[PDB]
Swiss-Prot record:
Induction: Up-regulated by the Ca(2+)-regulated transcription factor NFATC4. The modification N6-acetyllysine is found at K70, K213, K217, K223, K237, K238, K245. It comes from Homo sapiens (Human). GO terms for biological process: amyloid fibril formation; amyloid precursor protein catabolic process; amyloid-beta formation; amyloid-beta metabolic process; cellular response to amyloid-beta; cellular response to copper ion; cellular response to manganese ion; detection of mechanical stimulus involved in sensory perception of pain. Disulfide bonds join C160-C358, C216-C381, C268-C318. Keywords: Acetylation, Aspartyl protease, Cell membrane, Cell projection, Cytoplasmic vesicle, Disulfide bond, Endoplasmic reticulum, Endosome, Glycoprotein, Golgi apparatus, Hydrolase, Isopeptide bond, Lipoprotein, Lysosome, Membrane, Palmitate, Phosphoprotein, Protease, Signal, Transmembrane, Transmembrane helix, Ubl conjugation, Zymogen. This is Beta-secretase 1. The gene is BACE1.
Amino acid sequence: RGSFVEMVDNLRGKSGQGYYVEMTVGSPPQTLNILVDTGSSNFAVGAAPHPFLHRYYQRQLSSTYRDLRKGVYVPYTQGKWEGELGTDLVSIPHGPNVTVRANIAAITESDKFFINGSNWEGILGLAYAEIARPDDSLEPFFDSLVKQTHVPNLFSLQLCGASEVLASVGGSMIIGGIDHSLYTGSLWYTPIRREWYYEVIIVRVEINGQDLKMDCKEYNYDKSIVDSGTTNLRLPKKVFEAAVKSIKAASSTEKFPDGFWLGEQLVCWQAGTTPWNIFPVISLYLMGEVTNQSFRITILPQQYLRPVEDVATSQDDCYKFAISQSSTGTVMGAVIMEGFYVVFDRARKRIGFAVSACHVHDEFRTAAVEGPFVTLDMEDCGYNIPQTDESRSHHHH
Ligand SMILES: NC1=N[C@@]2(CO1)c1cc(-c3cncc(Cl)c3)ccc1O[C@@H]1COCC[C@H]12
Ligand code: NI
């Protein structure tokens, strides 16, 4: 292999509203646009009329649909979806040339799930069974794909970032391999700490080469994950505050409102005059495959300042600050992923990063992937989430 031309450029979306892939469900195939989400584990599709849907999965039109006679209820921080579990035939038209029978949650009711204008009608959770709903016995889509076909247990994502409409985004999801045209330089791997989310360990953070000098467990409190289903780089409270202070200090020639640093207000410059060089690079050092090694991924303001073309100020280039506070750990969302070709090597329990052939940069700086960095007697930077009685009581047969 080494080339997967048919799968290149198979992702689309609107800026800040997620990346989606075309999928088919049912016999004959019904096409739907599906949000690619490495931060969840259910395949769920709109299956009833909704104000924001032009189309939905019509179960009655599929000769191959089977009802599982079981519902599923999925509340989360920003919304809720619920529906009926079933199985049907699924394919990815610009993916592997295979058809699999997968679990499909037919979304019958939701709140704040669908987005007006995002153009997606469902979600493809690519994470592990441990976080599937209702429970871990509901086989996720990728597991079914691997078990039913000869598709290698690996996928990779190249997310490429950007007056009346939001900017169109594009990218590639390569299923079953690595496409060498999508990256340059070295491909560096960090271990998947545990198979639930795509959990990783950050060992060090630098802002313009300056170490934040925190106990490294703070960087992974209470976890750090790689999440295509999050736009921002989200950082634990303490880390966020230290980062903002450092970025403010570096960009201090400009005095932005508090709203900007909160991601609640755009800041603008006259077209093509954005002073990129006043904003610092951000480096996250990730644990290497070798104990005592790390490598760093470095992003630019071109990644963490998101372009938004507002109607009133269409003469100007306007930006949203896309680093935000978390209480659920580090989330390496599109802000991180748009710099890199990211390999989800499930077979080898590791995540690969390389400089993306499509990342946004200037003639002075580039997003980078660099290593090795060796630390004598490296500490354990992993956080151990307190075990609840709820979690502990679960039997895992
Ligand atoms: N990983 C992740 N998945 C979440 C939340 O975090 C999500 C995200 C978005 C979404 C909306 N706008 C932009 C993007 Cl990138 C994603 C839309 C729906 C959505 O529902 C998911 C349902 O499962 C829990 C995690 C949810
Ligand atoms: Ni038991």
